[PDB]
Structure formats: structure tokens, C-alpha cells
Specification:
264 residues; alpha/beta; Rossmann fold; eight-stranded mixed beta sheet; 17% strand; globular; AB_hydrolase_1; AB_hydrolase_fold; serine hydrolase activity; AB hydrolase-1 domain-containing protein; hydrolase
């Protein structure tokens, strides 16, 4: 039931998307790197609970790399939500549950803020509200091969596994990732965190549950816990850190299907 296809929305982004299952829609928005191979394992498990799961590579990244620059430069949470709604329209996805980590978490919050009608329920994980110190070196590195190396060693710091779950993403996926690192570095950390709608009025326009990785240092996403606690957004930790769908696919699937059926 795992269909793979491509499609172009009228904003010019030539997406690569995947779908599997039948039931209510559950969309898995990738993180900054925009590689939906990271959803390959848990997507089948989420679909096996009776849901149509949709995922895709993000504009300018991986197999969605055929996109205009603005879609991967000076990126805001509102730009990304605009792009996610466009493919959602093209796939007749009327309303869905949205997952998003990091930059994808900004996207879901922007979806709740500006497209609440379209979200049955949102789940955000480790959303950046500020520019993190260990990201600053990556910001405006002109050599793209140095940028990829430096970016890739900041990202594996954020992955919470050192025994192959990162490696078995494949060599094709890690090749696509190698081109993605410099493009993400130059478009996201200097532009997406300030745009994240964590406004008190913006978080309640739709159901939202919030998570942080159980093993990341408290100071990193402390703002996420305070923001979520100050506005009765349900908050919880998942295993691992920044990529729980990569390091803990089964527990991640149970969380996703638990939170979606709770609003069905």
C-alpha cells in the first residue's frame, strides 16, 4: 500500500511524496533536512493502525530539490506552512494530524496559527524559538563541502543513537542529505526560529500536544516546556533526542497513533 509519486504545486515546488494506508490522514512533516526516508520505518507502523500517512521531501531538499530558491532561503514557519498546505490541497487532504520536529515543529505551529481549519490535531517536537549557540558557525559558510561536514557533525550530535539507526537510513538517503546540509544551514537557523508563532492566542486555535526528547540537555528546549506548560498544551518526553522517528520508530509510532486517535 506504500505509494511513491511526485507532484508540483503551483508555487513551483516539485515535491516527492509517499503515502501508505487507508483511514484518516496523518501527515509527517520532516525536520530541517527535509528527508522523508527518516519516516520509512514508522510510517508503515502508523498506517497499520488504520491511517493514511502522507510524507514528502521538503522544498529544495532531497527529491524535492527542484524548487525555487525562496522556498529554501530565508525560511519562516509561515513559508513552510504555506508549502505544506499546497501539497495537502493537491492530495485532497482535507484535514489531518500533523507531526513536525525542529523546523517542522515551527511549521505545525504556523499551521495551527494560520490554517487551524485544516488541522485536526498538531504534534510538535523540539521547536527552535532562538538561535542555538552550536549552530552559529554553520550560518554563513560559503564552501558547501565544509558546510556539509560541519553541519553533519552538529546534526549527529542531535541524533540520540550511535548504533546504526542513523546509518541504515541508506547510502542514497545520506547522499541526498549531503547536498541538503549547506542549503538548510543557509536558509533555516537564521530565519525560522524568530518566526515561530508561540503566541498565547496562536497555540489554542487547534489541538496541540508537545514533546521534547528525553535525553537532550534541559537548557536547549526549556522554552518549549515553559511555553507548553503556561498554555495547558499537553507536554511529554519521547525517547531519544532530536530524531525520535529514526532512533525509536516503534515508540514514536505508538505516540503518533495514540495522539491522533484521541481526537477521533
Amino acid at each position: 500500500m506504500r505509494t511513491r509519486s511526485n507532484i508540483t504545486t503551483k508555487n513551483g515546488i516539485h515535491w516527492y511524496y509517499e503515502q501508505e494506508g487507508s483511514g484518516p490522514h496523518v501527515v509527517l512533516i520532516p525536520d530541517g533536512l527535509g528527508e522523508c526516508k527518516m519516516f520509512d520505518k514508522p510510517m508503515s507502523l502508523i498506517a497499520n493502525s488504520g491511517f493514511t500517512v502522507t510524507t514528502f521531501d521538503m522544498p529544495g531538499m532531497s527529491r524535492s530539490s527542484e524548487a525555487p530558491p525562496e522556498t529554501y532561503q530565508e525560511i519562516t514557519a509561515q513559508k513552510l506552512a504555506s508549502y505544506v498546505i499546497s501539497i495537502c490541497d493537491e492530495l485532497a487532504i482535507d484535514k489531518a494530524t500533523f507531526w513536525g520536529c525542529a523546523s517542522g515543529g515551527c511549521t505545525v505551529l504556523a499551521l495551527v496559527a494560520d490554517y487551524p481549519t485544516r488541522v485536526r490535531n498538531a504534534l510538535a517536537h523540539e521547536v527552535p524559538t532562538y538561535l542555538m549557540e552550536d549552530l552559529k558557525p554553520l550560518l554563513e559558510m560559503d564552501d558547501e563541502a565544509v558546510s556539509a561536514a560541519m553541519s553533519s557533525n552538529v546534526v549527529v550530535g542531535s541524533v540520540g543513537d550511535i548504533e546504526g539507526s542513523w546509518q541504515e537510513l541508506g547510502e542514497e538517503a545520506h547522499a541526498r542529505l549531503w547536498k541538503n546540509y549547506p542549503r538548510w544551514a543557509r536558509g533555516y537557523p537564521g530565519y525560522i526560529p524568530q518566526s515561530t508563532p508561540v503566541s498565547k492566542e496562536d497555540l489554542i486555535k487547534a489541538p496541540l500536544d508537545w514533546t521534547v526528547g528525553a535525553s537532550t540537555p534541559t537548557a536547549r528546549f526549556l522554552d518549549n516546556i515553559v511555553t507548553a506548560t503556561k498554555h495547558n498544551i499537553p507536554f511529554q518526553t519521547l525517547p531519544g533526542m532530536h530524531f525520535p522517528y529514526v532512533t525509536h520508530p516503534e515508540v514514536f509510532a505508538e505516540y503518533v497513533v495514540e495522539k491522533t486517535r484521541k481526537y477521533l
